[PDB]
Design a protein around this ligand. Sequence first.
Ligand SMILES: Cc1ccc(-n2nc(C(C)(C)C)cc2NC(=O)Nc2nccs2)cc1
Ligand SMILES: CCCCCCCCO[C@@H]1O[C@H](CO)[C@@H](O)[C@H](O)[C@H]1O
Length: 333
Amino acid sequence: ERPTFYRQELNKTIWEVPERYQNLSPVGSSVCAAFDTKTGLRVAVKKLSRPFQSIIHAKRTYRELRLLKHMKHENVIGLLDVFTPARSLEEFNDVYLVTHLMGADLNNIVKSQKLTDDHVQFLIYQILRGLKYIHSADIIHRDLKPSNLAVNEDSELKILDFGATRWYRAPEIMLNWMHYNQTVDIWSVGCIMAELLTGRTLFPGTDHIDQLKLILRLVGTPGAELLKKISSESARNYIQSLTQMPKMNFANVFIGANPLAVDLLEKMLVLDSDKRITAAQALAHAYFAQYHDPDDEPVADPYDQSLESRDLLIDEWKSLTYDEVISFVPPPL
Ligand SMILES: Cc1ccc(-n2nc(C(C)(C)C)cc2NC(=O)Nc2nccs2)cc1
Ligand SMILES: CCCCCCCCO[C@@H]1O[C@H](CO)[C@@H](O)[C@H](O)[C@H]1O
């Protein structure tokens, strides 16, 4: 049957949600923390901002719903629910998404203090285990960072994406290179790990260029093999036109850390993205010895990007989104 909806005025706009969801309290630009009476779980509720106003809003709406509906893995965020006040397509004009409210992001847990190696082990293992899953579906996250990592009291971790942040980007995204592979997320993880171990930000750039200067200082300049892959001429000639920086030995940056952590850091933060360690490979590194289970590091059913890269009319994306809402099966809990 249809649930019963109650109306409320949260964050400069009117929210309408099933009575099941209580204690509705805002947390960000829009997302509300809430308590779900049917299950006993603490949930995040997201009200889509004008989901069907533009072609881009409609496209964005359908993508996010489809993607989460396919996401079923312990270290990735998943849909607990999705609903609308609408009783028909014609009146369909608001979309709500429910997920676990883990408790904190990876900033609240760190609060700029050195975490123990055992604690790092566990968090990074969770990130990577989730990345292997995301990547096997052929999906690249593109914006990994601590604000996008949901963690509870017990350090259980889920990767999400709340659509300076620049501090964890692979250099290629910054440089608007257009062919990206999965290992951009691996650069971000390296930067994240480093931050948990030493307690400070790895590349705390002040701007776009500063961000790049700091990166080159740690990993050194491009070697001959990397210059060979630069598609542009001026860029090619610019890189040559510098003080050749010698790749710093990470053991001299991370003093007193687990050498297994250092080794893994050497392998993640390689400038040439074709030479970075994959998630699947990283899971098998000796640093996760105490957690690694090759029979419990699942992959995703294949995922269609193209259906998102389409050009349809607004009414079509809306109808496609509605169907997605109507066909939803909650995960048994
Ligand atoms: C346009 C668009 C499309 C997809 C996403 N992605 N991608 C992911 C992956 C599965 C981590 C890649 C997760 C999300 N979304 C997400 O976490 N949403 C959330 N809702 C409520 C609390 S957190 C975001 C925006
Ligand atoms: C200015 C110094 C920073 C430039 C180094 C970034 C190069 C990243 O590495 C590159 O990633 C590309 C994009 O996915 C791949 O196609 C290339 O094979 C790889 O070399």
